[PDB]
């Protein structure tokens, strides 16, 4: 399992163009196509991105391609972020997925807020970090997702996602 699978489960994968909460044309795992109100413009952007005639429908593999670009852009930001940089730098691959997961959820700025949690994570105090994370506002609002993410930080495995 990789990052794609974790997010496919927490956020959801859509193979046909859809509108998000706000009305924007999206696809894959929350991959924004365009802020234009046109379905055609949306399809046009997809074909560009794919490099082929899709008519608004992609394969899993393709979505994965897009998800990775999205992931790269997130990381690039992380790496220009003093508080986040050393933590990401310090985590293993699995654990890096969990952090990304958070970024995707609440943005770069929201995660930067977990001052302490972050400190513990960079120090490999997994449990304390998990304890710490559970006091957030985030943990109370999206508790299923948050439990799964914390469990990943705590164990360094995909156990939370095993039978999903």
Swiss-Prot record:
**This chain belongs to which protein, by name?**
Endolysin
On pH dependence, the entry says: Optimum pH is 7.3.
Task: List the active site.
Answer: 11 (proton donor/acceptor), 20 (proton donor/acceptor)
Main location (coarse class) = host cell
Which region is the signal sequence? none
Q: Which InterPro entries match?
A: Endolysin_T4_type (IPR034690), Glyco_hydro_24 (IPR002196), Lysozyme-like_dom_sf (IPR023346), Lysozyme_dom_sf (IPR023347), Phage_lysozyme-like (IPR052619), T4-type_lysozyme (IPR001165)
Q: Which GO biological-process labels does this protein carry? A: cell wall macromolecule catabolic process; defense response to bacterium; peptidoglycan catabolic process; viral release from host cell by cytolysis
Name the reaction it catalyses.
Hydrolysis of (1->4)-beta-linkages between N-acetylmuramic acid and N-acetyl-D-glucosamine residues in a peptidoglycan and between N-acetyl-D-glucosamine residues in chitodextrins
Classification via HAMAP family: ENDOLYSIN_T4
Q: Which residues bind substrate?
A: 32, 104, 117, 132
In the record, the note on similarity to other proteins reads: Belongs to the glycosyl hydrolase 24 family.
The record's function comment reads: Endolysin with lysozyme activity that degrades host peptidoglycans and participates with the holin and spanin proteins in the sequential events which lead to the programmed host cell lysis releasing the mature viral particles. Once the holin has permeabilized the host cell membrane, the endolysin can reach the periplasm and break down the peptidoglycan layer.
Pfam families attached to this UniProt entry: Phage_lysozyme (PF00959)
């Amino acid at each position: 399992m990789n990052c794609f699978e974790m997010l496919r489960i927490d956020e959801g994968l859509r193979l046909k163009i859809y509108k998000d909460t706000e009305g924007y044309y999206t696809i894959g795992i929350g991959h924004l196509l365009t802020k234009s109100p046109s379905l055609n413009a949306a399809k046009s952007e997809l074909d560009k991105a794919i490099g082929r005639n899709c008519n608004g429908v992609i394969t899993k593999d393709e979505a994965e391609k897009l998800f990775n670009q999205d992931v790269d852009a997130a990381v690039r930001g992380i790496l220009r972020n003093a508080k986040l940089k050393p933590v990401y730098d310090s985590l293993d691959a699995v654990r890096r997925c969990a952090l990304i997961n958070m970024v995707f959820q609440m943005g770069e700025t929201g995660v930067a807020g977990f001052t302490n949690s972050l400190r513990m994570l960079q120090q490999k105090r997994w449990d304390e970090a998990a304890v710490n994370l559970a006091k957030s506002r985030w943990y109370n609002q999206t508790p299923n997702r948050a439990k799964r993410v914390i469990t990943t930080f705590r164990t360094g495995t995909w156990d939370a996602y095993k039978n999903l």
